[PDB]
Design a protein around this ligand. Structure first.
Ligand SMILES: [Br-]
Ligand SMILES: [Br-]
Length: 116
């Protein structure tokens, strides 16, 4: 219900990816989080009855893993980019598929623990 939506949106708003990173990188990283995690989780918890207990521990662990997954994306976009110059669109594109794959796997695991 809308109480669960509020709780989940507030937790997603705590995600700080470092807004001084390249604008086009942040656009991609945030869009992946939005489309692979925030929107599908909001769809799920919006359907709960208002009295249903949502596992905040489950959502908070999901948030923690987003930082790890985005940090990996950023390293491969920048200094650890192998085949192209750091910050190049090739580096972003070359790392983006795996970033999204990791977010999809995190979504699948998070779904299992959402209900307390
Ligand atoms: Br949403
Ligand atoms: Br329910």
């Amino acid at each position: 219900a809308n109480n669960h939506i509020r709780t989940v949106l507030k937790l997603f708003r705590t995600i700080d990816l470092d807004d001084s990173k390249k604008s086009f990188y942040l656009t991609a990283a945030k869009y992946g989080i939005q489309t692979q995690l925030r929107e599908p989780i909001i769809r799920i918890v919006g359907g709960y009855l208002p009295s249903t207990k949502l596992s905040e521990a489950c959502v908070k662990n999901m948030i923690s893993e987003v930082y790890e997954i985005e940090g990996d994306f950023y390293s491969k976009f920048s200094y650890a980019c192998e085949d192209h110059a750091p910050y190049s669109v090739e580096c972003l594109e070359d790392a983006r598929d795996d970033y999204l794959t990791q977010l999809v796997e995190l979504f699948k695991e998070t779904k299992k623990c959402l209900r307390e």
